[PDB]
Paper text:
We prepared the [name] complex in a nonhydrolyzing condition and, after single-particle cryo-EM data collection and processing, we obtained 381,591 high-quality particles that yielded eight three-dimensional (3D) classes into which models were built. In the structures of all eight classes, [name] is threaded through the D1 pore of [name]. Protomers D, B and C were all ATP bound and formed the middle of the staircase. The bottom protomer, A, formed the base of the staircase. Protomer F, with no apparent density for nucleotide in D1, was not associated with [name]. This arrangement of the protomers is driven, in part, by the angle between the more mobile D1 domain and rigid D2 domain. From protomers E to A, the angle between the D1 and D2 decreases monotonically. The protomer at the top of the staircase maintained the largest angle between D1 and D2, while the one at the bottom had the smallest. In addition, the D1 and D2 rings are structurally conserved when comparing the D1 and D2 rings of [name]/[name] with engaged substrates, with an average Cα root-mean-square deviation (r.m.s.d.) of 1.64 Å.
After fusion, these bundles are disassembled by the AAA+ (ATPase associated with diverse cellular activities) protein [name]/[name] and its adaptor [name]/α-SNAP to make them available for subsequent rounds of membrane fusion. The side-loading and side-release mechanism explains how [name]/[name] can disassemble SNAREs with constrained topologies.
Residue numbers in the entry:
A (entry chain C): 217 to 758
B (entry chain K): 169 to 180
C (entry chain B): 217 to 478, 489 to 505
D (entry chain D): 506 to 758
């Protein structure tokens, strides 16, 4: 019985012995404050005051985000760590049935126990929970293409009529999870139906540390982890890792440590009592495991590694100036708080080595998020598919507070050929509108785009999208050739001497470009390493 | 690209 | 139940008597080490230690490669020599149906036995295996495929929700084979769903020698193979051959000999070098 | 008010974000154009038979037209305000673009008073000078929709911004605009300092030095305000002395 003193409810929902360190979900910390204030705060105050304010409780919750982040974990923990009736779990398309009027009945049967208990008792009914998984499967926008059978509308209408209708009900809480909130109906996301909506993003570095400490907890307290494992270093090494890949990393390290004793296969499959009572996972296991789990958000970093497979030979002095300018621009975008969009153009003669310089700058920048768009990735697709790919890639870059994008060979992304001239207007317009849209509030971008047909871009009237130019002239003197040959190991010192001496006599205003020079050296290494072959090739190519 | 429902009659 | 018990599992999952030399697959040695280390390594150690480490087992295995190079063979051998339950085979698009809502009910019926046995015997359950064949036929990227009635999205969502959902399973192992890995959905390859991905490729010279050795075995011990046949030379002449082509070569030479003999000369039947060279 | 957000008022925020850089009255022509816009708003509010008034705002690129139009729109206080810009239509197909434009125009005939703002008319039709290439269907849709009167006792004010006056002249689309406004670039070096005080770039002595140097070596000044602000922002963090600012200014001019 409630005494005179205003003491908390008898059968509370959250109880007073609760703290966010007991759930077991690491990383997200502000989201939990928001969720636990908006929804589970009006069910703890004594019923009298909550009745004197004339407000009803919120009856909906939506969680959305990328794949492998923690949505279902939150749903599970919320469902089975409260004081309420058991959840009525429903998978994605687990509602549909074959007969004419059985799908809607399946959606109606979820609410009946709650209705009965609310009718019988009133405001003392225990909380009920039902959780919809993969919400974006059946509940799509009404009147859209698809669902030729008349099922896409009846289901949505039934759910709308049963969540806020002519008969009231305020002892339920329905929770839904999805990867795409742009397809859920528009009448399902208004106050009274799915009020609180929360986005769950990739973890921060300190978030990665928290997740790592959460996963390796039973391992540490049973004395099964070595003393040379430093979790901060592991958080540092993992860049594009989501919550669901740290688990894979830990379990791969455990497999490496296990496999030494019972060597599956071979003849060493015999378990020895001594060495399984002294098991210990060490640092080398984690470092080896780092080679198994490959993050899915960091594929482009491998292509930016491939781009520079030829190495940055610091011949000449102009290279250092270009790299310094790139570093300056990266620093400016990092520090300034008003410049939220910086775009560059890197133009020069064909074969001069632009993509390599752009890739080098981007790699040495050290940003969390780096991507690259190239003709290779778009081969064979159709126009609509290409536009869709470009739009998706540009949309993925609007999260996080620091971003870098490398657009390669602009003139060949629009199918240019000078006979007509022919080209694609749609792709050109899409890029022209994409390179001037500021990202959301509190974000920054740095777009570096290379080209080799400066004049064509001038004619199209697209030279206003960019902000600053960087020219890359090709080698002209004859000492640069000597430096390249020294760093390529073509001949002995004497050989370089003879080749340069002879070339002096039959080569005025030497002008080739590095990409061709390296190929000529490579092919000349077989036929006649003496002067003749290299001189002939460099004369015929210049 | 078509689908179908189904109805049912009782016994005579 | 539990306590400190440093003794092997009650009903081990692999066997007391096993060795790669008798599996029947030749030319792939590194791949098998990787597979058996990552998948079947945590199912052999005593349950007490695995419980202490706070680990869960791997619930997927995808393996891909060009045509006719030994993928279905591995899927068959794994599912028949592991003291596990009877495999649940679904070959091709064998689930689609023409009644609304009955297409995915076939995907939810493959897991019923595993759930039923897990709910009763928690961690003493036997291993259940289900083999998906031609995985790329139905489980394409959701939202990109051409318009229709919306059955592709429902199938993909049903499998996604059943493989890793709000109710946990620790008995299931699911295997998938395909020739075009690019078409598979992006969310099915996340760790925890299809964690271990392996590639099977054309063999090199030693691989070709091993395949030849394990194909012509029952005709080498029955004393039905001549003494002038040398498998090293044959492994050297056949270049860029696959496993299926070597099997075809063997049975073609056998047919040559059998057709040649054609009353009771069958007692002396013997395959010779000339038959192999004509094949 | 930071937790609940409207669902229909999702386009006034974009208008509010177009004038984020802030308005500075570096001269008096700005006041005159704003007063003219306010006068037109008053006329459309008080009249009865003038149910449709259309304006054109034209000038050299980079002179800040969209911000000025958004500023006029936001100070009106009308119940209904909406904006169409290339950002909304990006990625759609031709039919989708036409449908979207038609629906937005049909949604402006409900409330008693309305304001509609069209941004960068030339880029809405995909104009590129190589061909010339452009989309005829969207042009005809817009041309038909800018002359249709709304139903009885409903008033609409349309403001469209363009930067290719000559191109519009060539298409012969110039008969469906009632009045025109021009926004010339800043041309007096003093105006630069008028902006400078508003931005607090450098000290007063530095301002005197920069203006004197540019007057020495910068006749016929022509920059545009957007470029000037970008240059000042760049010069804040690299080198406070004049060198960087003077170099950038003489480069743009
Ligand atoms: N914040 C986190 N803290 C701890 N573990 C996490 C976290 N996020 C994810 N995990 C790990 O990821 C595993 C699987 O993640 P989860 O079940 O949340 O997938 P999901 O986000 O629903 O993915 P999908 O889009 O495929 O449905 C969880 O069992 C947990 O091990
Ligand atoms: N600054 C540089 N110093 C040394 N080697 C360089 C440099 N820039 C590029 N290279 C070499 O150039 C080769 C790659 O050429 P790259 O792709 O950059 O040429 P490109 O001019 O961008 O090509 P395209 O003709 O397709 O426009 C690699 O060998 C790379 O090492
Ligand atoms: N590595 C191998 N060692 C021995 N025999 C092999 C090997 N690979 C293939 N074979 C032979 O190939 C026969 C058929 O190969 P299998 O059915 O496994 O090919 P597959 O990769 O599934 O083909 P597909 O892509 O056409 O479906 C097997 O019965 C076996 O005889
Ligand atoms: N009178 C003004 N005084 C100060 N700042 C202004 C003034 N007018 C506009 N601005 C600011 O300068 C920029 C105006 O340029 P904006 O891009 O909006 O116009 P535009 O000329 O139509 O552009 P575009 O270059 O795309 O053709 C915005 O930052 C705006 O805040």
């Amino acid at each position: 019985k409630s005494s005179n003193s205003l003491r908390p409810r008898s059968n509370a929902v959250i109880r007073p012995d609760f703290k966010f360190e007991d759930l077991g979900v690491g990383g997200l910390d502000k989201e939990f404050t928001k969720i636990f204030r908006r929804a589970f705060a009006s069910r703890i105050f004594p019923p009298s005051v909550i009745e004197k304010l004339g407000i009803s409780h919120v009856k909906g919750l939506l969680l959305y985000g990328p794949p492998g982040t923690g949505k279902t974990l939150i749903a599970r923990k919320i469902g089975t760590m409260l004081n309420a009736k058991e959840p009525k779990i429903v998978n994605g398309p687990e509602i549909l049935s074959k007969y004419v009027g059985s799908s809607e009945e399946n959606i109606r049967n979820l609410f009946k126990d709650a209705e009965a208990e609310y009718r019988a008792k009133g405001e003392e009914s225990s909380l009920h929970i039902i959780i919809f998984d993969e919400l974006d499967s059946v509940f799509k926008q009404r009147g859209s293409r698809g669902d030729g059978t008349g099922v896409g509308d009846n289901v949505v209408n039934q759910l709308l009529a049963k969540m806020d209708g002519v008969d009231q009900l305020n002892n339920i809480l329905v929770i839904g999870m999805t990867n795409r909130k742009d397809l859920i109906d528009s009448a399902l996301l208004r106050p009274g139906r799915f009020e609180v909506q929360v986005e769950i993003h990739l973890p921060d570095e300190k978030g990665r540390l928290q997740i790592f400490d959460i996963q390796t907890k039973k391992m540490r307290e049973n004395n099964m982890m070595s003393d040379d494992v430093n979790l901060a270093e592991l958080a540092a090494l993992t860049k594009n890792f989501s919550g669901a890949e740290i688990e894979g990393l830990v379990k791969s390290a455990s497999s490496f440590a296990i496999n030494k004793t019972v060597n599956i296969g071979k003849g060493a499959t015999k378990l020895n009592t001594k060495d399984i009572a002294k098991l210990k996972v060490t640092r080398e296991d984690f470092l080896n495991a780092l080679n198994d789990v490959t993050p899915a958000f960091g594929i482009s970093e491998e292509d930016l590694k491939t781009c520079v497979e030829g190495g940055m030979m610091l011949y000449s002095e102009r290279v250092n100036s270009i790299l310094k300018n790139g570093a300056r621009y990266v620093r400016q975008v990092r520090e300034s708080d008003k410049s939220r969009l910086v775009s560059l153009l890197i133009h020069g003669p064909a074969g001069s080595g632009k993509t390599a310089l752009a890739a080098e700058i981007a790699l040495k920048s050290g940003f969390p998020f780096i991507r690259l768009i190239s003709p290779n990735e778009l081969s064979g697709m159709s126009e609509s598919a290409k536009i869709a790919y470009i739009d998706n890639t540009f949309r993925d870059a609007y999260k996080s507070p620091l971003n870098i994008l490398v657009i390669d060979s602009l003139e060949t992304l629009v199918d240019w050929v000078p006979i007509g001239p022919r080209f694609s207007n749609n792709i050109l317009q899409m890029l022209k509108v994409a390179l001037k849209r500021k990202p959301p509030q509190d974000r920054r971008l740095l777009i570096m785009t290379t080209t080799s047909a400066y004049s064509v871009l001038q004619q199209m009237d697209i030279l206003s999208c960019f902000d600053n130019e960087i020219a890359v002239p090709n080698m002209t003197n004859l000492d640069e050739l000597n430096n390249v040959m020294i760093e390529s190991n073509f001949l002995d010192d004497a050989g370089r001497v003879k080749v340069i001496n002879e070339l002096s006599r039959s080569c005025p205003n030497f002008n080739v470009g590095i990409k061709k020079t390296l190929t000529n050296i490579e092919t000349a290494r077989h036929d006649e390493d003496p002067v003749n072959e290299l001189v002939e090739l460099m004369t015929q190519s210049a | 690209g078509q689908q179908i429902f189904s109805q049912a009659l009782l016994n005579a």
